[PDB]
């Protein structure tokens, strides 16, 4: 037995990315770097559950037609891994290319690092009140599993209903041409080395609206996903005075105005 | 069903070289150069559909993964190998530099030798930004193209929309793009027969040999491919002649990669060739 | 036929860690590194006698337990005889060994197969080849055997303690393997002349005639055999106050430590130490005797180590608690 | 027929540690390192002649002790008799031998099985192979061996002296195996023409006629052989006075020798040397002759400093005792 | 279909070296070296067609002389006759070959057996090093190949011209393999604009139709492998004057080459060349035509000045000879 | 079928050692280093057909000795028969021989056993791996083999001369193996033009016809066999008086030589030389001719100094010999 998806607290970057990937798998995969203790492998296994013939998870070549695939070892991979990711999003086995990375040791190669389309980072909690909450939850889980999940059972049905309703809202796009020109302009303003970025963000932010249930796409929607998919492609130079995400925010502000 | 070879926005450098190598099997391949993206792989797979031992069906494109050995490459036993599939087809090599072996040398040697006869094309790619190939092994390739990322808002949105369109309805689009594709196929079929009729003046041969000799280019490989490429281009334009202008359009990208590597200063690659061409010609 | 446990002179810190870990297997193992001599394993191999007893289903090569389906083997899960008194088994692997014995060979029983609910001892862990050491990282932290190859599949629970020793002036395992071991303790050399004379005389005396000497120490050691079973009974009665947890999670968070890996063990180590003493409540003193031992190899900082890690932990503890 | 022992000219220091090890088969081993030549490898192979007898049961590859019911290896423990006296054996392993015969694979007896309680000689231990050296790293100084190659996992007694030679120009020993040996003796070439003439003449004479050369020394060899047996029975009578045991321990403190192993071996050898002379009361100037050659290779020091590693031990000896 | 030899334009030096090596198959081969292009690997392939015929025994795994020697090689010695009068073959080895394949294993012949008394072509000799270059250091210059691998033990005759090429900007060879080569012919690319057009036209004409090209050159080329054969019969009739031989060694000693192999080669090459041109005598001109490109290969490396190769040899030859 | 040994032009010093190593086959060996060419590997190979005869036991592969001490292997020693008077042999191992055909395993007779009381020619000894040179290190200078690799436990009586060649422009020998060689000789290229003319003519004439050359150089060779047979029996008659044996060792003491093996060889080589010129009394000029090449390499190089080895040895001779 594993935690339900509504057990992780505070840290929420991966949730948005994984839920966006689940609704539409055309984006690709997600690359996450973080420590070996903060709980990267625990939260993902939760997402394996509560996933909506009569249909109702793979860990590292044929049984991948439905369901995500977790690698756990791609970071130290030297080569070949390119073959599996190319073959995945090439029709003749659609699945989510969720992956695990570490800030040190293997960092992959810029030739491959631009085949994924999503990237989020992990930061420390730095909160005594929250850490004791997590410790208490883990302890009461360890005391006995079965009664713990039943307590959090009610919200899982609501989450499933929301995901199912949002999945079938594909025609809701209403994406404005002027905003498409503006996003292409801001992306092309910095060095991106290809057209991989523009296609990913155009089909990502729109889908976020489908999560909420609205129809139109405004600046607020894009602002929350613009950094998350156009940061690791910004490998300008090792002279990193500040994190590239802040540079993305700077160019975002200088163009739209905020 | 795949993307047609007419909707690729811009990038006339790759298309011209690919067409020339298609209409002239003995040129010796291309080494498309550039950074990531910009449709290196889409164009190659878009070329295969646009196509109609010693003595016929539809052509097939053959590719191999980066991780391979002689178990599949050789195709040892009457088992036919991977190369024994393109008797009238094409073969693709990716990240050539990442393949540290003599297998790449074997493939180059198998070219221009129809004895198992294969007679395919040898498009090369990779090396976005990870060290140039060996100065010897790079000298057995016909022409060296180049790809650069488009820098403009008007096109950058359009291409994206175009791609999105192909995911709205992958079928029901070829008929919309049918008339453009058929025009190119008929033209290339016609041009494949007019080639053995071009005449090159002896006087221009002296001038082109002088142009080659003025540069400190080693060997004679720079004067066995240009003569064929100019004839192929002139035949492609549907004529039986050659002027000084046609050679100019297939000389910069045919001999650029044979130049001296020495970084004495920052002379541009094509600028030196253009300067020499202007110096020894009346253009 | 070996050196009795209650004959070691000095080296108190290692004994405390070993007994604390053997009280409750939810520890994560113990790491021992230090100079030659000083009886690194002279003590570890002496733990065969000082062990409790557990019930095991009869004629079970996998050493399963009554019920406990979560960790119940195949022959009791899908098929479902009486249990009997049995001893906790300690097994060790040599530095030079093949890979056939460690894993399965096809079902044959592997080295880990006859290691459940026991203690795994490795000697000179810094000299083992990387081929074998990459298999233990699979069975550990997963609690399940993996070998199912050769066309026929087989599953097997696997859980041990994995305590080991080594030498610090040759290498330190892998950067990631250090996090598998929950506890880490080091030994120095006692330089008091009287203690050295005492240990030399003790070793010489035992070297004369084994059976007469060991029996002399019988009255004391047996008492320990009837003092460690008390901790395993009073353990599920200790309680922690919110003021204690809010500080055990504050001291760790103040230092640049990996998230929720150091706080969990320190919350389960001191809480068990009282059971060894015999009380039912935890005081501030009990924190001081386990805080240094637990948060040592998690402390990742700059390569410069002019200060002492134990000194840093003690001073931050004093500053936070005001002691 | 090999060179007789009591004919080697000079080299008094090296010609005593071997006898000390022969008298008491528990101290450890003697590793001899010196310049090329000097006959390091001719004394060791000639030691087989001067050799006492020990009792060992009949029809047993392990050569177990008929008494001491705690040392029975495999089946005579279950059976718990043709007791016979026998000469102890000498077995040397070649440098170009694999691990098949060193440990044992099939249960056939390995090379280590054939050298129980005897003498194991290694030639040019400086090189070996850095891979086979690991299996014997822990088998010695433990008294037990375990083999698990295929289908057999049995505990195997193993004890020997592990004498070895070397050359200090092809590398240095690993700082872990260096502590298994007991004493370290250095060799310096002779520098007097008369002795060189003597050794050349004696070698030529032996090469002239092997058999008639032995009779010129046989009574001396018999006389030496009688002395070893007598000193092998009077050993458990000597006794170290308590003040001396405290005094010797303080020497190990000042030199900062890591590990409490130098103290044990230094004490053990002092008793044996006294039994060789015939007395039964150790005294100062009797351990003075056995300390400088036992606290030299265990002395970690500054990379360069300025000591031959020989003056410091005697300086501390003089400071402590006073001579 | 291959490019006819007589159609190759230019390169009047390397053609001479190859032709002089074919007529007298004992000089020691050539080591053609130069920049890219210029057809270094075209002529070698072309020379296969223009080759003579030699007698050989049948059923023999490797070529051998029918009855000229006493056949001290293998069972042909005491078994002593089918002769097929076959043609000498061309054998080449790849850069990725392995040592066992070159010699043999459990008796399967290797590459050496095939390339005996023949032209063994080595591709890019500069890159190959260490492995599979030490075994070749005894098969040549001795005539006998010794194989003592995997128990199999025989003796193998072997001698070959060993024609090898390579690039001049990828390092230089070690001296041991450098002196096994007879001559050393350097290639320089044509630079006159009036000449390259001819090469381009000839290549284009050949590529248009490989047939109807040999007939355009068949009468001319068939007049080449008639002068060579006739030159072979005349060769064992030349008589170099004694006076010249004195002066030839003077150049060698004055230039201070290393060894003595630099004087046996020159005489044989001069005799073969003077037999090629038709006469049955030797003049000064014949020496000057081949001494330039024989000794230069063996000069001493010197980076202290800017003196090229061949220039010094010509200067010394002019100074010591007539004019 | 091979080049005659007595027709070698010049190089007297190389001819001296290869004869002294056959008259009394108890010296360590020889080592000759020099430039390319100059026939280092031609003189050595010509020695095969000029050797004496010794008795052998039946057809044993180990080449035992019937009328000799207890050195007749182990299987023959059970007896203590037919006599054949065979001729000694020389066996050479290649540059890439596998471990199977050096120590021997299966009992398949190894290469060392088949080269007992013979000569082992190690060509190009400058290029040999760190392996295959240790298994050769113990068999020499000890005269007993020990193979314990694959289930076989056999001790072989092995003894050879260990003749090796090579050139010094590719590395330096290891310190241990550099001492097993007996005497070291140097080769320098000839410079007189007339000698070069003679040597070229000789080689060309020999190559012209393999036979009908022994028919010329027969009488000058058959006299050498009876020149060595007589000298092989007068050796155990010559005695060096005690006056000079004291002096020779002094020389070594002055040169700071390492070991006492560099002094035994000279006292034996000097006795061998005087038995070759007919005399039966060693005097000066019979040890002066051999002390130069038997002590040249057993000397500390000390690259700080800039004095050649040859001059230093002769400089100190007159210091104590008054010349
Ligand atoms: N209480 C003690 N303190 C120190 N040394 C002791 C003590 N009791 C025994 N010894 C001795 O210390 C030595 C160390 O024993 P052990 O076999 O464990 O070696 P070690 O050096 O600790 O282990 P390793 O060689 O694996 O590092 C032995 O000689 C042992 O008799
Ligand atoms: N007292 C002595 N000191 C030195 N050498 C002696 C002495 N007595 C005899 N010798 C002779 O000196 C020689 C030394 O060679 P030996 O085989 O003993 O060396 P080793 O110990 O194997 O040397 P290495 O250190 O090179 O392995 C032998 O010929 C031996 O007979
Ligand atoms: N006389 C000639 N001189 C130079 N090139 C010639 C001559 N005759 C023909 N050629 C042509 O010149 C070209 C040189 O290419 P080729 O393959 O022979 O080069 P190469 O010397 O073998 O090169 P590499 O060093 O790369 O192996 C070929 O097309 C060959 O047909
Ligand atoms: N006495 C001699 N001195 C020098 N050279 C001689 C002598 N007798 C013959 N030669 C000839 O000199 C040449 C030397 O070549 P050889 O093969 O003997 O050299 P090497 O010493 O074996 O060389 P390497 O060091 O390459 O093994 C041969 O042609 C040989 O016939
Ligand atoms: N919400 C949470 N916040 C903090 N820590 C958590 C949380 N959930 C689980 N953990 C802890 O994190 C552990 C998993 O750490 P994780 O980083 O996934 O390991 P790894 O990176 O080695 O796979 C869990 O076993 C638990 O102790
Ligand atoms: N006309 C076009 N010009 C440039 N790029 C294009 C065009 N059409 C599609 N693409 C892009 O090319 C990408 C795939 O090719 P590419 O990434 O270049 O392959 P590779 O990375 O192997 O070179 C697609 O993601 C697509 O967005
Ligand atoms: Mg230990
Ligand atoms: Mg020795
Ligand atoms: Mg070539
Ligand atoms: Mg030779």
Residue numbers in the entry:
A (entry chain F): 14 to 65, 101 to 104, 108 to 111, 142 to 173, 188 to 353
B (entry chain A): 14 to 65, 77 to 79, 103 to 124, 137 to 174, 186 to 353
C (entry chain E), D (entry chain D), E (entry chain B), F (entry chain C): 14 to 93, 99 to 124, 137 to 353
Wording from the paper:
Magnesium chelatase is a conserved enzyme complex responsible for the first committed step of chlorophyll biosynthesis in photosynthetic organisms, which is the addition of magnesium to the chlorophyll precursor, protoporphyrin IX. The complex is composed of the catalytic subunit ChlH, the bridging subunit ChlD, and the subunit ChlI, which serves as the motor that drives the entire complex. The motor subunit ChlI belongs to the superfamily of AAA+ (ATPases associated with diverse cellular activities) proteins and, through binding and hydrolyzing of ATP, provides the energy for the thermodynamically unfavorable reaction of Mg2+ insertion into protoporphyrin IX. Here, we used a combination of cryo-EM and functional analysis to investigate the mechanism of the ChlI motor subunit of magnesium chelatase from the cyanobacterium Nostoc sp. PCC 7120 (hereafter, Nostoc).
Iterative rounds of 3D classification, performed by multiple-class ab initio reconstructions followed by heterogeneous refinements, revealed two distinct classes, which we named hexamer conformations A and B. These reconstructions achieved global resolutions of 4 Å and 3.8 Å, respectively, with much greater local resolutions in the central parts of the structures. Conformation A is characterized by ATP molecules bound in five monomers and ADP in one, while conformation B has ATP bound in four monomers and ADP in two. Interestingly, each monomer contains a bound nucleotide molecule (ATP or ADP) in both hexameric states. The Nostoc ChlI hexameric ring conformations have diameters of approximately 114–117 Å, with a central pore of about 33 Å. In the hexamer structures, the nucleotide state of each monomer is related to the structural organization of the insertions of that monomer, such that when an ATP molecule is bound, the insertions are folded and in an upward position. If ADP is bound, the inserts of this monomer are more flexible or even unfold, as demonstrated by fuzzy or absent corresponding cryo-EM densities. Interestingly, in the observed ADP-bound states, the side chains of the adjacent R210 arginine fingers are positioned somewhat away from the nucleotide (inset 5), in line with data from other AAA+ proteins. Arginine finger R210 and sensor 2 R291 residues from the adjacent monomer additionally coordinate the nucleotide molecule and contribute to the inter-subunit cooperation within the hexamer, which is typical for AAA+ proteins. Not only the structured inserts undergo conformational changes upon ATP hydrolysis in ChlI but also the whole hexamer ring experiences rigid-body rearrangements apparently caused by the ATP hydrolysis-induced reorganization of key amino-acid residues in close proximity to the nucleotide-binding pocket. According to our model, ATP hydrolysis occurs in one monomer at a time, triggering rearrangements involving residues near the nucleotide-binding pocket.
